[PDB]
Amino acid sequence: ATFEIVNRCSYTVWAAASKGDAALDAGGRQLNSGESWTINVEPGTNGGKIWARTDCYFDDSGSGICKTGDCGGLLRCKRFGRPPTTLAEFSLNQYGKDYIDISNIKGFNVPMNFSPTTRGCRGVRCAADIVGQCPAKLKAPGGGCNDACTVFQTSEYCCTTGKCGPTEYSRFFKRLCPDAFSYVLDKPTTVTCPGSSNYRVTFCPT
Protein backbone atom coordinates (compact mmCIF):
# COMPACT_ATOMS: atom_id res chain seq x y z
CA ALA A 1 0.00 0.00 0.00
CA THR A 2 1.19 3.48 -0.71
CA PHE A 3 0.93 6.33 1.76
CA GLU A 4 1.77 9.78 0.48
CA ILE A 5 2.77 11.90 3.48
CA VAL A 6 2.43 15.63 2.76
CA ASN A 7 3.58 18.47 5.00
CA ARG A 8 1.32 21.49 4.39
CA CYS A 9 2.53 23.12 7.63
CA SER A 10 4.60 26.28 7.51
CA TYR A 11 7.17 24.53 9.69
CA THR A 12 9.31 21.46 9.08
CA VAL A 13 8.12 18.16 10.47
CA TRP A 14 9.85 14.81 10.70
CA ALA A 15 7.37 12.21 9.61
CA ALA A 16 7.40 8.83 11.28
CA ALA A 17 5.88 5.47 10.44
CA SER A 18 5.98 2.35 12.62
CA LYS A 19 3.98 -0.68 13.73
CA GLY A 20 5.48 -0.56 17.19
CA ASP A 21 8.09 -3.28 16.86
CA ALA A 22 9.38 -2.27 13.45
CA ALA A 23 9.70 0.66 11.05
CA LEU A 24 7.30 0.95 8.16
CA ASP A 25 9.39 1.72 5.04
CA ALA A 26 12.36 3.82 6.19
CA GLY A 27 10.50 4.68 9.42
CA GLY A 28 11.07 8.45 9.24
CA ARG A 29 12.18 11.39 7.15
CA GLN A 30 12.36 15.15 7.23
CA LEU A 31 9.57 17.01 5.41
CA ASN A 32 10.13 20.69 4.87
CA SER A 33 7.03 22.86 4.33
CA GLY A 34 5.34 21.63 1.18
CA GLU A 35 7.31 18.41 0.76
CA SER A 36 5.74 14.99 0.02
CA TRP A 37 7.21 11.59 0.93
CA THR A 38 5.63 8.42 -0.43
CA ILE A 39 6.11 5.26 1.58
CA ASN A 40 5.27 1.64 0.97
CA VAL A 41 3.50 -0.28 3.74
CA GLU A 42 3.30 -4.07 3.48
CA PRO A 43 -0.16 -5.54 2.97
CA GLY A 44 -1.52 -7.04 6.17
CA THR A 45 0.17 -4.49 8.42
CA ASN A 46 -1.76 -4.46 11.66
CA GLY A 47 -1.53 -1.59 14.12
CA GLY A 48 0.46 0.81 11.96
CA LYS A 49 0.79 4.48 12.84
CA ILE A 50 2.03 7.59 11.10
CA TRP A 51 2.73 10.83 12.99
CA ALA A 52 4.64 14.08 12.81
CA ARG A 53 7.52 15.05 14.99
CA THR A 54 8.45 18.66 15.72
CA ASP A 55 11.62 20.56 16.65
CA CYS A 56 14.05 17.77 15.89
CA TYR A 57 17.85 17.67 15.80
CA PHE A 58 19.70 14.73 14.24
CA ASP A 59 23.39 14.08 13.80
CA ASP A 60 24.97 12.57 10.69
CA SER A 61 24.20 9.05 12.06
CA GLY A 62 20.45 9.81 12.39
CA SER A 63 20.51 10.08 16.20
CA GLY A 64 19.16 12.99 18.17
CA ILE A 65 15.95 14.30 19.74
CA CYS A 66 12.52 15.75 18.92
CA LYS A 67 10.30 17.84 21.18
CA THR A 68 7.21 15.93 20.16
CA GLY A 69 6.91 12.35 18.93
CA ASP A 70 10.54 11.32 19.50
CA CYS A 71 11.04 7.59 18.85
CA GLY A 72 14.05 6.61 20.93
CA GLY A 73 16.06 9.47 19.41
CA LEU A 74 16.11 7.97 15.90
CA LEU A 75 15.45 9.74 12.61
CA ARG A 76 14.28 6.39 11.24
CA CYS A 77 11.70 5.30 13.77
CA LYS A 78 11.39 1.62 14.68
CA ARG A 79 9.04 2.21 17.60
CA PHE A 80 6.17 4.51 18.52
CA GLY A 81 6.75 8.11 19.45
CA ARG A 82 6.66 10.04 22.70
CA PRO A 83 3.38 11.90 23.37
CA PRO A 84 1.95 14.32 22.47
CA THR A 85 1.37 12.89 19.00
CA THR A 86 -1.67 13.18 16.75
CA LEU A 87 -1.94 9.64 15.29
CA ALA A 88 -3.00 8.33 11.91
CA GLU A 89 -3.73 4.66 12.68
CA PHE A 90 -4.39 1.77 10.31
CA SER A 91 -4.72 -1.97 9.94
CA LEU A 92 -4.59 -3.23 6.37
CA ASN A 93 -6.06 -6.36 4.74
CA GLN A 94 -7.94 -7.51 7.83
CA TYR A 95 -10.40 -10.07 6.44
CA GLY A 96 -10.68 -8.23 3.15
CA LYS A 97 -10.88 -4.63 4.42
CA ASP A 98 -8.70 -1.82 5.66
CA TYR A 99 -9.45 0.18 8.84
CA ILE A 100 -8.30 3.72 9.42
CA ASP A 101 -8.73 6.33 12.14
CA ILE A 102 -7.23 9.41 13.77
CA SER A 103 -6.55 9.28 17.51
CA ASN A 104 -5.90 11.90 20.17
CA ILE A 105 -5.48 9.18 22.88
CA LYS A 106 -1.74 9.98 22.96
CA GLY A 107 -2.37 13.72 22.70
CA PHE A 108 -2.08 16.18 19.83
CA ASN A 109 0.87 17.94 18.26
CA VAL A 110 0.11 18.70 14.63
CA PRO A 111 -3.24 18.86 12.77
CA MET A 112 -3.84 15.99 10.35
CA ASN A 113 -6.06 14.74 7.49
CA PHE A 114 -5.93 11.00 6.72
CA SER A 115 -7.76 10.13 3.52
CA PRO A 116 -7.87 7.38 0.92
CA THR A 117 -6.51 8.20 -2.54
CA THR A 118 -8.50 5.31 -3.95
CA ARG A 119 -12.27 4.72 -4.11
CA GLY A 120 -14.75 3.42 -1.63
CA CYS A 121 -14.53 5.28 1.69
CA ARG A 122 -14.17 8.69 3.28
CA GLY A 123 -11.24 10.31 5.05
CA VAL A 124 -10.99 11.59 8.60
CA ARG A 125 -9.57 14.83 9.91
CA CYS A 126 -8.49 16.53 13.13
CA ALA A 127 -7.44 20.03 12.15
CA ALA A 128 -8.75 22.26 14.94
CA ASP A 129 -6.31 24.37 16.99
CA ILE A 130 -6.01 21.88 19.81
CA VAL A 131 -2.59 23.23 20.89
CA GLY A 132 -3.83 26.80 21.12
CA GLN A 133 -6.99 25.85 23.00
CA CYS A 134 -5.39 23.14 25.17
CA PRO A 135 -6.44 23.06 28.83
CA ALA A 136 -3.67 24.52 30.98
CA LYS A 137 -3.06 21.27 32.88
CA LEU A 138 -2.58 19.36 29.58
CA LYS A 139 -0.15 21.79 27.93
CA ALA A 140 3.18 20.11 27.23
CA PRO A 141 6.06 22.44 28.08
CA GLY A 142 8.01 20.83 25.28
CA GLY A 143 5.19 21.61 22.82
CA GLY A 144 1.71 20.18 22.06
CA CYS A 145 -1.32 19.12 24.10
CA ASN A 146 -0.94 16.00 26.22
CA ASP A 147 -3.61 13.42 26.81
CA ALA A 148 -4.78 13.02 30.42
CA CYS A 149 -3.31 9.51 30.78
CA THR A 150 0.18 10.84 30.02
CA VAL A 151 -0.23 13.66 32.50
CA PHE A 152 -2.02 11.99 35.45
CA GLN A 153 -1.45 8.23 35.15
CA THR A 154 -4.82 7.12 36.50
CA SER A 155 -6.83 4.01 35.75
CA GLU A 156 -9.69 6.24 34.59
CA TYR A 157 -7.69 8.21 32.04
CA CYS A 158 -5.56 5.26 30.86
CA CYS A 159 -8.54 2.84 30.81
CA THR A 160 -6.36 0.31 32.55
CA THR A 161 -9.22 -1.91 33.80
CA GLY A 162 -11.05 -1.66 30.47
CA LYS A 163 -13.67 0.24 32.40
CA CYS A 164 -13.50 3.96 31.93
CA GLY A 165 -15.81 6.72 30.82
CA PRO A 166 -15.37 10.05 29.09
CA THR A 167 -13.74 12.78 31.17
CA GLU A 168 -13.52 16.57 31.15
CA TYR A 169 -10.19 16.16 29.37
CA SER A 170 -11.39 13.61 26.78
CA ARG A 171 -14.40 15.82 26.04
CA PHE A 172 -12.05 18.71 25.16
CA PHE A 173 -10.36 16.66 22.47
CA LYS A 174 -13.75 15.35 21.28
CA ARG A 175 -15.29 18.82 21.10
CA LEU A 176 -12.42 20.15 18.99
CA CYS A 177 -12.16 16.95 16.89
CA PRO A 178 -15.31 14.84 16.84
CA ASP A 179 -13.91 12.48 14.20
CA ALA A 180 -10.88 11.34 16.28
CA PHE A 181 -10.66 8.98 19.23
CA SER A 182 -10.56 10.99 22.47
CA TYR A 183 -10.19 8.15 24.98
CA VAL A 184 -9.71 4.37 24.81
CA LEU A 185 -13.45 3.47 24.90
CA ASP A 186 -14.71 6.33 22.78
CA LYS A 187 -17.47 5.49 20.34
CA PRO A 188 -15.36 4.42 17.36
CA THR A 189 -14.64 6.80 14.49
CA THR A 190 -12.85 4.08 12.49
CA VAL A 191 -13.54 4.07 8.75
CA THR A 192 -13.76 0.85 6.78
CA CYS A 193 -12.07 1.06 3.40
CA PRO A 194 -11.66 -1.50 0.65
CA GLY A 195 -8.76 -3.90 1.32
CA SER A 196 -5.54 -2.67 -0.27
CA SER A 197 -6.60 0.97 -0.52
CA ASN A 198 -3.94 3.69 -0.79
CA TYR A 199 -3.78 6.80 1.33
CA ARG A 200 -2.53 10.33 1.92
CA VAL A 201 -1.67 11.77 5.36
CA THR A 202 -1.60 15.59 5.18
CA PHE A 203 -0.16 17.57 8.07
CA CYS A 204 -1.77 21.01 8.50
CA PRO A 205 -4.50 20.34 5.92
CA THR A 206 -6.23 23.68 6.48
Swiss-Prot record:
CDD domains: TLP-P (cd09217). Keywords: Cytoplasmic vesicle, Disulfide bond, Signal, Taste-modifying protein. InterPro entries: Osmotin/thaumatin-like_sf (IPR037176), Thaumatin (IPR001938), Thaumatin_CS (IPR017949). Belongs to the thaumatin family. This is Thaumatin I. The keyword Repressor does not apply. The keyword Disulfide bond applies. Disulfide bonds join C9-C204, C56-C66, C71-C77, C121-C193, C126-C177, C134-C145, C149-C158, C159-C164. One of its GO terms (cellular component) is cytoplasmic vesicle. SUPFAM superfamilies: Osmotin, thaumatin-like protein (SSF49870). It is found in: Cytoplasmic vesicle. Taste-modifying protein; intensely sweet-tasting. It is 100000 times sweeter than sucrose on a molar basis.
